[PDB]
């Protein structure tokens, strides 16, 4: 598994 | 705002 | 996967 | 904010 | 199992 | 901050 | 049974 | 900090 | 049974 | 600190 | 985003 | 965006 | 975008 | 876009 | 765009 | 356009 | 994010 | 993020 | 992340 | 984490 | 207009 | 016009 | 017109 | 004209 | 309008 | 408006 | 506009 | 606008 | 606004 | 605004 | 009318 | 009317 | 007429 | 008429 | 008309 | 006519 | 009306 | 008539 | 109008 | 007539 | 009727 | 009847 | 009949 | 008839 | 007939 | 015949 | 017949 | 006959 | 026979 | 027979 | 896989 | 794969 | 693949 | 394997 | 295996 | 398996 | 197998 | 088997 | 099994 | 069997 | 019982 | 308007 | 408007 | 008993 | 506005 | 008894 | 705004 | 009894 | 503001 | 007996 | 046991 | 109104 | 034990 | 109103 | 025992 | 009305 | 065990 | 009305 | 077990 | 009416 | 009443 | 946009 | 954005 | 009343 | 962001 | 009264 | 993050 | 009164 | 982390 | 009044 | 330990 | 009534 | 440990 | 009746 | 562990 | 009735 | 883990 | 009736 | 993980 | 019956 994120 | 997403 | 957004 | 996350 | 972890 | 975890 | 933990 | 635990 | 621990 | 318990 | 704004 | 204003 | 006006 | 106006 | 007015 | 009118 | 603002 | 203001 | 700010 | 400013 | 008579 | 008359 | 008569 | 009569 | 009467 | 009269 | 009247 | 009367 | 009158 | 009146 | 009888 | 028996 | 029993 | 029986 | 009968 | 028997 | 009989 | 029987 | 009478 | 069984 | 053993 | 057996 | 055994 | 046991 | 068995 | 078993 | 397990 | 087992 | 195995 | 595994 | 992410 | 994102 | 994207 | 992450 | 992470 | 976190 | 941590 | 770990 | 580990 | 560890 | 009604 | 009714 | 009544 | 009412 | 009312 | 009210 | 009332 | 009430 | 007021 | 209140 | 009611 | 009733 | 009432 | 009562 | 009240 | 009952 | 009942 | 029953 | 009914 | 049962 | 409103 | 209302 | 209101 | 509100 | 408000 | 906000 | 407020 | 907020 | 405040 | 915090 | 009780 | 118990 | 219950 | 037990 | 039961 | 069980 | 059960 | 059953 | 059962 | 599983 792997995730990324970014908000803003 | 923006956002980003990664999987795998 | 990749994911992009861009709202406002 | 960013985050992250790995299982496995 | 693993985990991973990264907020800010 | 950070965060890992594992089980067994 | 085994846990593992680091939070900061 | 940092934890562990142990059950068994 | 059996317990284990480690805090900080 | 450091903890341990056994019941049994 | 979320905002309230109760008066009373 | 989410905006609510109770009055009362 | 949402809007809400609750008076009472 | 929505807008609600509850009266009451 | 959507409009309701609830009066009551 | 929607308009709704709810009296009661 | 989430804001509250209640106001009584 | 969360934040709330009771003024009263 | 939470805050609140109790005022009275 | 968690903060709190009760002011009174 | 309405009216509600709830004896009991 | 409506009118509602429960008895229990 | 509507009238309504729950009894019980 | 309506007339309901639920009894029970 | 609405108007409601509980006795009991 | 509404208005109640809860006699009990 | 809202009014209760509470006998009891 | 919001008005009890609360007797008893 | 909102008022409350408790007689008793 | 908030106004009680308690009286008793 | 409306009777109520708990024994217990 | 309405009648009620709990036993218990 | 309506009649309730619970026994328990 | 409406009868009811709860054994437990 | 309401009655009410605890034994108990 | 209607009879009603939970048995639990 | 409402009437209230506790015996205990 | 109606008839009701829940064993359980 | 509303009537107490606890017995005990 | 009916009748019904519901064991369950 | 009721009964209880609270044995501690 | 009704039985408890609290052991504790 | 009921009957309950809460050990603890 | 029913029973329960809850050990804990 | 019921049992329950709630370990914990 | 009903039975339950949570473990937990 | 009726059986459940819920381990958790 | 019914079996069920959920777990968690 | 109806069978069910809920995991999670 | 029927069997269901609903994993999640 | 199943993935959800609710913000707000 | 399923993948949802509900923003609000 | 699915997607959804509910803004509101 | 199901992962939800609710941000507020 | 189910995994939710509440952050606020 | 489940696990939960939640941060606040 | 159950787990939840709540931090804060 | 249930485990929780409530740091504050 | 339960266990619980409030620390705070 | 139950086990609850407060530190603090 | 006996019953009436009058409107207008 | 006008009614009229007798039960039983 | 005008209203009538009268019940046994 | 015996009811009246009057709007307007 | 008018009311009018007579009870019993 | 008898009431009255009078808005406006 | 006005009022007006008389009781009994 | 009586009353009166004035606003504005 | 202003207010106004008679009981009795 | 009689009040007044006035804000502003 | 045994038990009795009469009304009216 | 008239009432009778016995126990046991 | 044996019980009776009356009331008007 | 009148009242009557009698116990064992 | 045997008991009487009178209002009015 | 009139009723009667006995139990075991 | 056993049971009776006689209405009217 | 008459009734009859008897269970095990 | 067994059972009986027997109704008029 | 007539019944009979036998279970087991 | 009366009422305006005006977007935009 | 534009609006214009009247009631009554 | 714009908005306007009169209510009254 | 009056109200107005602008965003943007 | 910006915001704007009058009532009353 | 009169209000503002501005974010960002 | 940035703030803004007036009341009044 | 007046108001402000800055983090980070 | 920073923060800022003004009141009054 | 005015104020201040810093963290880490 | 033992126990016994008897009554009636 | 009978009651017989062992412990231990 | 071990346990007995009798009734009847 | 008739119980049996045994724990561990 | 272990457990037993017999009920009959 | 006769139960079996073995954890562990 | 293990389990077992036995009935009848 | 048997049962088995295995975990992990 | 693993499971089995069986039946009968 | 028989039953057998593996996930992962």
């Given at each position: 598994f792997?995730?990324?994120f970014?908000?803003?």
């Open positions: 792997k995730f990324e970014k908000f803003e």
